[PDB]
């Protein structure tokens, strides 16, 4: 039960954008320019990590 | 100086407008990034029966 509960929380924890406009890498680069898009993902990898 | 202030949609979903964009063959289950009317996604796309 503990192992299963922890595993799901590790999958549901892909939700929060972590203080950015978007909460999905796929759309971060599509609608932003690295100069201003990279700082957005700065809190995404920093969040998932 | 005409200072008439206008305002379009502010972060709303697609509507009766369609920008000048082309079309291409869709992706069924390919594990690649996709584009369908702006929205972009990656990973693996799997078909369910919902």
PDB file of C-alpha atoms in Angstrom:
ATOM      1  CA  UNK A   1       0.000   0.000   0.000  1.00  0.00           C
ATOM      2  CA  UNK A   2       2.780   2.442   0.892  1.00  0.00           C
ATOM      3  CA  UNK A   3       4.764   1.618  -2.249  1.00  0.00           C
ATOM      4  CA  UNK A   4       1.717   1.909  -4.515  1.00  0.00           C
ATOM      5  CA  UNK A   5       0.607   5.173  -2.899  1.00  0.00           C
ATOM      6  CA  UNK A   6       4.073   6.703  -3.278  1.00  0.00           C
ATOM      7  CA  UNK A   7       4.359   5.656  -6.928  1.00  0.00           C
ATOM      8  CA  UNK A   8       1.062   7.294  -7.897  1.00  0.00           C
ATOM      9  CA  UNK A   9       2.003  10.513  -6.099  1.00  0.00           C
ATOM     10  CA  UNK A  10       5.137  10.558  -8.262  1.00  0.00           C
ATOM     11  CA  UNK A  11       2.922  10.509 -11.372  1.00  0.00           C
ATOM     12  CA  UNK A  12       0.215  12.904 -10.178  1.00  0.00           C
ATOM     13  CA  UNK A  13       3.052  15.285  -9.227  1.00  0.00           C
ATOM     14  CA  UNK A  14       3.493  16.277 -12.891  1.00  0.00           C
ATOM     15  CA  UNK A  15       0.672  18.814 -12.474  1.00  0.00           C
ATOM     16  CA  UNK A  16       1.901  22.076 -10.972  1.00  0.00           C
ATOM     17  CA  UNK A  17       3.493  24.457 -13.524  1.00  0.00           C
ATOM     18  CA  UNK A  18       5.912  25.554 -10.783  1.00  0.00           C
ATOM     19  CA  UNK A  19       5.446  29.305 -11.078  1.00  0.00           C
ATOM     20  CA  UNK A  20       5.261  29.585 -14.873  1.00  0.00           C
ATOM     21  CA  UNK A  21       2.686  30.363 -17.546  1.00  0.00           C
ATOM     22  CA  UNK A  22       2.434  26.731 -18.665  1.00  0.00           C
ATOM     23  CA  UNK A  23       2.745  23.355 -16.897  1.00  0.00           C
ATOM     24  CA  UNK A  24       3.917  21.179 -19.807  1.00  0.00           C
ATOM     25  CA  UNK A  25       7.315  21.167 -21.514  1.00  0.00           C
ATOM     26  CA  UNK A  26       5.771  20.498 -24.927  1.00  0.00           C
ATOM     27  CA  UNK A  27       4.031  23.893 -25.015  1.00  0.00           C
ATOM     28  CA  UNK A  28       6.786  25.843 -23.224  1.00  0.00           C
ATOM     29  CA  UNK A  29       9.050  25.805 -26.285  1.00  0.00           C
ATOM     30  CA  UNK A  30       6.254  25.931 -28.873  1.00  0.00           C
ATOM     31  CA  UNK A  31       4.841  29.307 -27.792  1.00  0.00           C
ATOM     32  CA  UNK A  32       7.928  30.936 -26.236  1.00  0.00           C
ATOM     33  CA  UNK A  33      11.450  31.898 -27.357  1.00  0.00           C
ATOM     34  CA  UNK A  34      14.314  30.176 -25.435  1.00  0.00           C
ATOM     35  CA  UNK A  35      15.570  33.663 -24.287  1.00  0.00           C
ATOM     36  CA  UNK A  36      12.209  34.026 -22.438  1.00  0.00           C
ATOM     37  CA  UNK A  37      11.082  30.378 -22.641  1.00  0.00           C
ATOM     38  CA  UNK A  38      14.143  28.855 -20.956  1.00  0.00           C
ATOM     39  CA  UNK A  39      13.532  30.758 -17.715  1.00  0.00           C
ATOM     40  CA  UNK A  40      10.013  29.302 -17.798  1.00  0.00           C
ATOM     41  CA  UNK A  41      11.347  25.733 -17.868  1.00  0.00           C
ATOM     42  CA  UNK A  42      13.858  26.864 -15.235  1.00  0.00           C
ATOM     43  CA  UNK A  43      11.141  26.069 -12.683  1.00  0.00           C
ATOM     44  CA  UNK A  44       9.866  22.997 -14.561  1.00  0.00           C
ATOM     45  CA  UNK A  45      12.966  20.795 -14.394  1.00  0.00           C
ATOM     46  CA  UNK A  46      13.712  22.426 -11.041  1.00  0.00           C
ATOM     47  CA  UNK A  47      10.213  21.289 -10.056  1.00  0.00           C
ATOM     48  CA  UNK A  48      10.167  17.741 -11.395  1.00  0.00           C
ATOM     49  CA  UNK A  49      13.746  17.190 -10.213  1.00  0.00           C
TER      50      UNK A  49
ATOM     51  CA  UNK B   1      -4.659  60.807 -31.839  1.00  0.00           C
ATOM     52  CA  UNK B   2      -7.317  58.083 -31.840  1.00  0.00           C
ATOM     53  CA  UNK B   3      -6.853  56.371 -28.466  1.00  0.00           C
ATOM     54  CA  UNK B   4      -9.747  53.942 -28.874  1.00  0.00           C
ATOM     55  CA  UNK B   5      -8.812  50.918 -26.765  1.00  0.00           C
ATOM     56  CA  UNK B   6      -9.521  47.469 -28.216  1.00  0.00           C
ATOM     57  CA  UNK B   7      -9.224  44.027 -26.651  1.00  0.00           C
ATOM     58  CA  UNK B   8      -9.214  40.532 -28.140  1.00  0.00           C
ATOM     59  CA  UNK B   9      -9.600  37.224 -26.304  1.00  0.00           C
ATOM     60  CA  UNK B  10      -7.296  36.885 -23.280  1.00  0.00           C
ATOM     61  CA  UNK B  11      -6.267  33.227 -22.942  1.00  0.00           C
ATOM     62  CA  UNK B  12      -9.372  31.518 -24.321  1.00  0.00           C
ATOM     63  CA  UNK B  13      -9.677  28.240 -26.226  1.00  0.00           C
ATOM     64  CA  UNK B  14     -10.160  28.010 -30.013  1.00  0.00           C
ATOM     65  CA  UNK B  15     -13.193  29.808 -31.411  1.00  0.00           C
ATOM     66  CA  UNK B  16     -14.871  30.586 -34.743  1.00  0.00           C
ATOM     67  CA  UNK B  17     -11.572  32.115 -35.988  1.00  0.00           C
ATOM     68  CA  UNK B  18      -8.895  30.034 -37.725  1.00  0.00           C
ATOM     69  CA  UNK B  19      -5.534  31.643 -38.440  1.00  0.00           C
ATOM     70  CA  UNK B  20      -3.806  31.194 -41.796  1.00  0.00           C
ATOM     71  CA  UNK B  21      -2.256  27.792 -41.072  1.00  0.00           C
ATOM     72  CA  UNK B  22      -1.918  24.630 -43.142  1.00  0.00           C
ATOM     73  CA  UNK B  23      -2.726  20.988 -42.343  1.00  0.00           C
ATOM     74  CA  UNK B  24      -0.842  17.695 -42.353  1.00  0.00           C
ATOM     75  CA  UNK B  25      -1.473  13.999 -41.795  1.00  0.00           C
ATOM     76  CA  UNK B  26      -2.380  13.265 -38.182  1.00  0.00           C
ATOM     77  CA  UNK B  27      -0.543  10.965 -35.762  1.00  0.00           C
ATOM     78  CA  UNK B  28      -2.380   7.936 -34.379  1.00  0.00           C
ATOM     79  CA  UNK B  29      -0.065   6.389 -31.772  1.00  0.00           C
ATOM     80  CA  UNK B  30       3.416   7.743 -32.558  1.00  0.00           C
ATOM     81  CA  UNK B  31       5.529   8.626 -29.510  1.00  0.00           C
ATOM     82  CA  UNK B  32       6.390  12.068 -30.878  1.00  0.00           C
ATOM     83  CA  UNK B  33       5.511  15.699 -30.291  1.00  0.00           C
ATOM     84  CA  UNK B  34       2.263  16.718 -31.983  1.00  0.00           C
ATOM     85  CA  UNK B  35       0.546  19.943 -33.029  1.00  0.00           C
ATOM     86  CA  UNK B  36      -3.244  20.240 -33.420  1.00  0.00           C
ATOM     87  CA  UNK B  37      -4.351  23.890 -33.424  1.00  0.00           C
ATOM     88  CA  UNK B  38      -1.452  25.238 -31.383  1.00  0.00           C
ATOM     89  CA  UNK B  39      -1.496  22.700 -28.560  1.00  0.00           C
ATOM     90  CA  UNK B  40       1.783  20.771 -28.485  1.00  0.00           C
ATOM     91  CA  UNK B  41       2.512  17.578 -26.581  1.00  0.00           C
ATOM     92  CA  UNK B  42       5.124  14.857 -26.283  1.00  0.00           C
ATOM     93  CA  UNK B  43       5.515  11.375 -24.821  1.00  0.00           C
ATOM     94  CA  UNK B  44       3.398   8.462 -26.060  1.00  0.00           C
ATOM     95  CA  UNK B  45      -0.156   8.875 -27.368  1.00  0.00           C
ATOM     96  CA  UNK B  46      -2.314   5.806 -26.713  1.00  0.00           C
ATOM     97  CA  UNK B  47      -5.924   5.269 -27.774  1.00  0.00           C
ATOM     98  CA  UNK B  48      -8.527   4.368 -25.145  1.00  0.00           C
ATOM     99  CA  UNK B  49     -12.208   3.424 -25.403  1.00  0.00           C
ATOM    100  CA  UNK B  50     -13.563   6.198 -23.179  1.00  0.00           C
TER     101      UNK B  50
END
